Each structure stands twice: as C-alpha cells, then as structure tokens.
Write a protein that binds this ligand. Structure first.
Ligand SMILES: *[C@@H]1O[C@H](CO)[C@@H](O)[C@H](O)[C@H]1NC(C)=O
Ligand SMILES: *[C@@H]1O[C@H](CO)[C@@H](O)[C@H](O)[C@H]1NC(C)=O
Lengths: 193, 594
C-alpha cells in the first residue's frame, strides 16, 4: 500500500499550532523519496533516525503532525527547546526519533489584509507536556481577583498570527510537518524497500 | 502573583497587539507616502485613530501597576514609557484647544507665503522659493527684505498663539508630575534605578553647558574665519570687532552653514572631490548604489537584508503618475519589514544619504529582538549618530578607491582634506551653538526665567552672546522669530542634533580606534574591519533596553557626553584655522549697535 504522506503534505488547509493535526500512518509501505520530491524545504533537521536509514528500518506507527507557525518559531520545534510554541503550543519529547519537515508557505497562508485564521496560545497556567494538545479558550486570570470576562488582569489566552505577504522571512507562515517514528513490541507495520 | 509578575503579562499582550496595530499603521502611512490619494489618506487616518485609541486604552489600563513594586529594570522602563499621561491630563476643552492651536500653528507654518514684494500676484512659497533665494544671493537688500518679511508674517500672527501654546504646554507638564515643558522634554535623557550609571535633567543641563564651554574656541575660530571671508565678499557690511548679520548665514534660519562654502573656499584652484561623473560613466543604477552600500555593511560585519527589503521598498522616482514624497526615510514597519522610501539619483549626496538611511535600517534590525516599547535608540541621539558614522566611513577617499569607483591613480594633498574638514565643520560644528541657544531659550521660557512680556529682546541678546549674530533691523516685542523654525512651531525637541554630533564623533573615534588605524581621525574607515563592526553591533542590539550612559561606554568607554573626539577630529582644521586668523580679530562683542 501507499502511505498517505502526500495527503498530509498536500493538504489545502493546515491547522493552527495550538490545535495541531495528528494523523497516524500505518498498514502501508514507506516512501520517503516521494516526500523528497515535494518541495525545497527550509528545515530538515531530523533527530534520531538518519535519513539514509529511513528506507532501511521498520517503525510501528508514524505520526505526521502539521501546523503553521512563524519562521522564528521553527527553531522551537526540537527537543529541549523553550518558548511560546515549545511550552504552551507544541512540545516534542527529549527522546524524539522522527523528522521535522518545515517549508515556507507565505504564498498560500497570507491574505494581504491579515490572515487571522491561525492562532497560538501565549498564556497558560502550566507548561505543556510532550505531545499534548490543549484547546480551551478560557480567559487567563493573571491578577489576584476572580475573572468576570475580559477587563483588567483577565486576558484571552489565544493570540492570532496576523499573516501578510509583506512580512520578512521569520514572520511568514511556515507549514511545519514533523514525522515521528514510534516503536513498540508489536510486529512491524510500516516497512519499505 | 506579584505586581512585577502581572506587569509582565500585560506588557506581553501590549507587545503583540501593538506590533499588529503598528504594522498596520506603518503600512498605511507607507501606502500614503508612496501613492498620495484620497482613499490612502482616509485609510492612514483610520489606522492612526485606531492606534491612538489603543495606546490611550493601554495607558489607562497600565495605571494599576505602581513603579514602587516593580523591580525588573526592563519592565520598569516599559511601564514608564507606557504609564505617561501625556495630554490626557488636561481638561477636555483644554485638550481640544491645545490640539487645535498646534494644528493651526502647523498649517500656518506650512502654508505661509511671502506676497509682500511688489504685487501680491507673486506669492513666494517657503519651500521652493525662500530656500532657493537664501541658498545663494549676492544682494544684501533682497536677503534682508525676504528675511524681514518672513519673520514679520510669522511673528505678527503667532505671538499670542505661541504664548497660549506655551501656557498650555507648561500647564500640561506641571500636571504631569514635572516642573515645566523643558523638564518634560529633558525627561528622556534621564536614568534612575541603577547605580553608577545615573542621569538627571539638571545633569543634562550642566553637561551641555560644560561641553559648549569646552567647544567654544573651535566655533569662535570658525566664526572669525567665515566673518573675514564674508567681509572680503561683502564690502562695508560687517564690523571688524562685531558679530555678522544673521540673515547671511546660508540658510535663513541660520541652523546650517553648508551654503556658505561657495564664498569660503580655502583653495579655489583645487576643486572638491566629486563622484558624479565617474558614477554616470560606470552606468550606475539606483539599485547599484544600495547594492554597494549593503556590500560595505557586510564587509564591516553587519548582516545582509532580506528580499522583502528589495521587492517592497522603492528606490526610484515612479514618474509623473503615482506621485510620492522625496523625503529619504528609513521605515521599520514592525514585523520583519524594513524599507527605505527615497528617490535615488546618481549623485554624491544621494550616495551618502543611502548609507545614512541604511545605517538606520541596520539599527532597526539590530534592536528588532527587543520588546516593542524598547525598539528605539537609548536616546533620540543614537539613530542619527549611527547613520552619520556610516556616512562618514562611506565618504572617505580610501573607501571610494576600495569600492572601485575612484581612480587609484588619484593622489591626496593637504588642500583636499582641509577642504573636507572645513565642509564638515560648516555642516557639524556650525549647528551646535545654534541648537544649544535655541534649546536653552525654550527651556528658560517654559521654566519661567524669561518673562512673557520680554521674549524677543532676551532671545536676540542670547543670539549675540552664544551664536554671535546681530539683528539686521531692531525688533520690537510683537515678534515671534523662534516660531518661524519648523521644530519650534511643530513642538519638536531640538537638542537631538547637539546630542547626535557629540555621540557620532565619539562613536567614530572609538570604532576606528578598535579598527587598528594609525593616522588622522578624519580618514578613519570602518570598511573591512569585523572587530569594529562587532563593537558597534554590541551597542546596536541593546536598543533602549539599557540606559544610554551604559550603551555609550559599551562602545566608546565613557559614560558621559564628550567633546575631545569632536575637537581632535577637526585637529588639522583647528591648527589651520589658528594659523589663518593671526592678524584678524579674535572673538565677538555685543557693543555693536545700529
Ligand atoms: C500537490 O500540491 C501541488 C502544489 O502545491 C499541486 O500542484 C498538486 O496538484 C497537489 N497534488 C494533488 C492535489 O494530488
Ligand atoms: C484535523 O484534520 C481533520 C482532517 O484531516 C479535520 O477534520 C479536523 O477538524 C482537524 N482538527 C484540527 C484540530 O485542526
């Protein structure tokens, strides 16, 4: 069978970094050359399994997360990193055996008047444990008084990533697609020659 | 949750929404300036109204965090820049009156015309006509008539208006927990909260006074030299022991003496160095000038600039259609968007101003990492200082030879750099006494030392004492001569230029001292020197995060304003001036009277 790598990479719409999209991939044959023949990416720094041995191993489950962030915040998609994206939005485990693919997509994810369809969580009471998804638009109580709905010391958590094509590199949208490779004691499911 | 810990969350949401509302406002302003059209003006006005409303709302919301419970220095600085009451401390009627009077002052300075000569059919506009007629003129009568007509048409209409403006601004400053409007203006050269690096407004006054006192001899010698040259040019118009009339000081305002170089050529047989002919001979486009400037900046050590700087920013005149404004400006839109708005021409002046604005752009990229309220120079005199050191480095003949534009066969003789030093002094050291006099007069007018009923007499007496120029005609009390200045009428601080020069010369001396350069200071070049680039970038990346008394030392080595770099920069010029005015009189006296 053919793994749905193309559908993950070719998706017309991409999720937001706070509500990122996870798609388990299994019961197919790995084809990483197809992944290569997609686009000239901006980052391919992929920790753990080497790209050469990608077509020489058998990873039980493949997780293809996908979201849109800034260019500065791509460097926060890596084990042992800190920031707004690596503490509240999307944290990777220290034992990350997968590949983080992240190209530039300002051509499709910009509207010339503010593409406020992409959000990110900037305030949270506690940090985010690895591979945890939190979507709760509850007003954040920064002050010492109970929150009655916005107003002083009560801020909406999620802040939108106002995207425009005129932004310089680093603030333009970046469709990041990490490709985690989890392994268990179950028989090998994803294998490719 | 401590006050210092809630301050930080408010400040974070300010930072995000404010960055969005500035890239919106700055984009609207750029669209207006590039293409002037009614919808563009409406959009810019809407964006500015939204930005002002957001700033007012955030300033009102930030009053709940007192500065006594704030311990972090950066958070305290951001709150101080955000907790300012501004003009909202006045009554609504008083605030509306102040806004209206400022607006009418601006619109009467901008739209003023001189129809007094002959018939009112020929109304001479200030910008195209008055500047052209004041840049060069061989007739005393026309210069005097134009100067007197402009001064009268300004003062006779803005004297009570300026009195009301002064009263309103003083009341606002007093209600703003300050002493007067001059104190409010000086409240930005102020550091308090860190030991060792601290500053006060009175300390600023004393430092300015001491720097001017130790800079007086050089300006006095230059004034004597230019007075002798004008006496040679103008027969029977100046006194040997008296101050020269003000209206012949090149520009009508007398702020800059650059226009007097034509009559004060040290060596007419040796023409000044020019690159226009060699630049057109090489077929240099508007893109090549910026390409070479970026190459110089990279050679220094500063990084390249993105493709968004090249595709978005416009560098050439767009022709008859799509009218724009030819004011060279370095735009920092707010989110990775850096642009320069200028109509580049094939000239030496445009080539140098390209580097001048490109340095501001480099400063913007350097401090882009800082929070929103700390994305500025540590004071208002840092941006222009960096631009000017860029221009000074780019204008050296050795750099011109290195870039390949100048012929290597060219040789340097003492006349060349002596003329260059004289031009620099006319541009730089000739605007320090005027700036200091104007700022001191405004400070004492706002403070109350100068009585309201006695403005013109004290201003002109200060002009004799400090700048050293007499009145072409006696002036009564129904005049507002300082209001004719753009900065005074538009409520702008003027000490920026004094601070800019006194910082730029220290910066250049420190940078080229670390570049392992042996020789004169005026030939210092930062090109192909990574150490000086790193030393400058260390200060550039700071922005307003740390006090200017520390950022100045981080690149120079001193925590205070200094004149010795300025004095020894013009050292060969100083010795030449000393050797020149031997038999001529030294100094000016106020005893002269018409
Ligand atoms: C994949 O995307 C490219 C452009 O991004 C498009 O040309 C191609 O048709 C897509 N493949 C599909 C829709 O199967
Ligand atoms: C994830 O993607 C699926 C389709 O691939 C969509 O139905 C779902 O709403 C998405 N969820 C989020 C949180 O974006």
């Amino acid at each position: 069978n053919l793994c749905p790598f193309h559908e993950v990479f070719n998706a017309t719409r991409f999720a937001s970094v706070y509500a990122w999209n996870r798609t388990r991939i299994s019961n197919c044959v790995a084809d990483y050359s197809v992944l290569y023949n997609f686009a000239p990416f901006f980052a391919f720094k992929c920790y753990g399994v080497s790209p050469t041995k990608l077509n020489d191993l058998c990873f039980t489950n493949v997780y293809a997360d996908s979201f849109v962030i800034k260019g500065n915040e791509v460097s926060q998609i890596a084990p042992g990193q800190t920031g707004n994206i690596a503490d509240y939005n999307y944290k990777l485990p220290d034992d990350f055996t997968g590949c983080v693919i992240a190209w530039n997509s300002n051509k499709l994810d910009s509207k010339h008047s503010g593409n406020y369809d992409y959000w990110y969580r900037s305030l949270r009471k506690s940090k985010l444990k690895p591979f945890e998804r939190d979507i709760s638009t509850e007003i954040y109580q920064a002050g010492n008084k109970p929150c009655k709905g916005k107003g002083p010391n009560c801020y909406f958590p999620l802040e939108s990533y106002g995207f425009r094509p005129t932004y310089g590199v680093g603030h333009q949208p970046y469709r990041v697609v990490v490709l985690s490779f989890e392994l268990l004691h179950a028989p090998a499911t994803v294998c490719g020659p | 949750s401590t006050i210092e810990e809630q301050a930080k969350t408010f400040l974070d949401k300010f930072n995000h929404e404010a960055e969005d509302l500035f890239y919106q406002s700055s984009l609207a302003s750029w669209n207006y300036n590039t293409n002037i059209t009614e919808e563009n003006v409406q959009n810019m006005n809407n964006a500015g109204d939204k930005w002002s409303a957001f700033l007012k709302e955030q300033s009102t919301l930030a009053q709940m965090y007192p500065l006594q419970e704030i311990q972090n220095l950066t958070v305290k600085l951001q709150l101080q820049a955000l907790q300012q009451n501004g003009s909202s401390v006045l009554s609504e009627d008083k605030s509306k009156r102040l806004n209206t009077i400022l607006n009418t002052m601006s619109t009467i300075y901008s739209t003023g015309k001189v129809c007094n000569p002959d018939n009112p059919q020929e109304c001479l506009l200030l910008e195209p006509g008055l500047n052209e007629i004041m840049a060069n003129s061989l007739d005393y009568n026309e210069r005097l008539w134009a100067w007197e007509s402009w001064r009268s048409e300004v003062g006779k209409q803005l004297r009570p208006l300026y009195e009301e403006y002064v009263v309103l601004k003083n009341e606002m400053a007093r209600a703003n927990h300050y002493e007067d409007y001059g104190d409010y203006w000086r409240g930005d050269y102020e550091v308090n909260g860190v030991d060792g690096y601290d500053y006060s407004r009175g300390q600023l006054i004393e430092d300015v006074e001491h720097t001017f006192e130790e800079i007086k001899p050089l300006y006095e010698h230059l004034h004597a030299y230019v007075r002798a040259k004008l006496m040679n040019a103008y027969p029977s118009y100046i006194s040997p022991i008296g101050c020269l009339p003000a209206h012949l000081l090149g520009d009508m305002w007398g702020r800059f003496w650059t226009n007097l170089y034509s009559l004060t050529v040290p060596f007419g047989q040796k023409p000044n160095i020019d690159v226009t002919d060699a630049m057109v001979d090489q077929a240099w486009d508007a893109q090549r000038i910026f390409k070479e400037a970026e190459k110089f900046f990279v050679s220094v050590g500063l990084p390249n600039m993105t493709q968004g700087f090249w595709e978005n920013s416009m560098l050439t005149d767009p022709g008859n259609v799509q009218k724009a404004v030819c004011h060279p400006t370095a735009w920092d839109l707010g989110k990775g968007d850096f642009r320069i708005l200028m109509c580049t021409k094939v000239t030496m002046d445009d080539f140098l101003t390209a580097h001048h604005e490109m340095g501001h752009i480099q400063y913007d990229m350097a401090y882009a990492a800082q929070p929103f309220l700390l994305r500025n120079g540590a004071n208002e005199g840092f941006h222009e200082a960096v631009g000017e050191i860029m221009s000074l480095s780019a204008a050296t003949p050795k750099h011109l030879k290195s870039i390949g534009l100048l012929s290597p066969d060219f040789q340097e003789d003492n006349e060349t750099e002596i003329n260059f030093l004289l031009k620099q002094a006319l541009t730089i050291v000739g605007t320090l006494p005027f700036t200091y006099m104007l700022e001191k007069w405004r400070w004492m007018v706002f403070k109350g030392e100068i009585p309201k009923d006695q403005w013109m007499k004290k201003w002109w007496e200060m002009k004799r004492e400090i700048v050293g120029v007499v009145e072409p005609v006696p002036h009564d009390e129904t005049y507002c001569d300082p209001a004719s200045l753009f900065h005074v009428s538009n409520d702008y601080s003027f000490i920026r230029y004094y601070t800019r020069t006194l910082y730029q010369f220290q910066f250049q001396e420190a940078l080229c001292q670390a570049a392992k350069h042996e020789g004169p200071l005026h030939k210092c070049d930062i090109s192909n020197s990574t150490e000086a680039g790193q030393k400058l970038f260390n200060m550039l990346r700071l922005g307003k995060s740390e006090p200017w008394t520390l950022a100045l030392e981080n690149v120079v080595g001193a925590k205070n304003m200094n004149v010795r770099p300025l004095l020894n920069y013009f050292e060969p010029l100083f010795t030449w001036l000393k050797d020149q005015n031997k038999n001529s009189f030294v100094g000016w006296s106020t005893d002269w009277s018409p």
